[PDB]
Amino acid sequence: MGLTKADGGYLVPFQLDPTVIITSNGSLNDIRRFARQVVATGDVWHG
Amino acid sequence: VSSAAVQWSWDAEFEEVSDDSPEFGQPEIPVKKAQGFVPISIEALQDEA
Incomplete structure (x- = not known):
């Protein structure tokens, strides 16, 4: 064995x-840690 | 213990008989031994299933 x-x-x-x-x-x-993160619904976001 | 039969004879009148002593024997059967051995290693003993 x-x-x-x-x-x-x-x-x-x-x-x-x-x-x-x-x-x-x-x-x-690390830009996602300092940047504003909005949420969209269609194809273009307007502010 | 083993033995054999007795030899008989056809004898006449006023004739002596023959000495008939059956010889004996003693068969004997000794008892002997067999063996076998299988070494192994610790790791093998711990890994193999």
Whole structure:
């Protein structure tokens, strides 16, 4: 018995963790934290 | 314990009989042993199901 696949390793169940780890560089911005955010209803907003 | 039968004879008148002593025997059967062994490792014992 051992951890080698030919000596009893075939009984070891596979382990996978389904949380994806994002690797993209992306882009950061903080304008939404200082800017006014209105809500619209049609296609153009008038003030 | 084992043994055998007794040999008889057809004898005449005023004739001696023959000594007929059956010999015995003692069969004996010894008791023997068999074995087998399977070592394992701790990790293997903890991972394999």
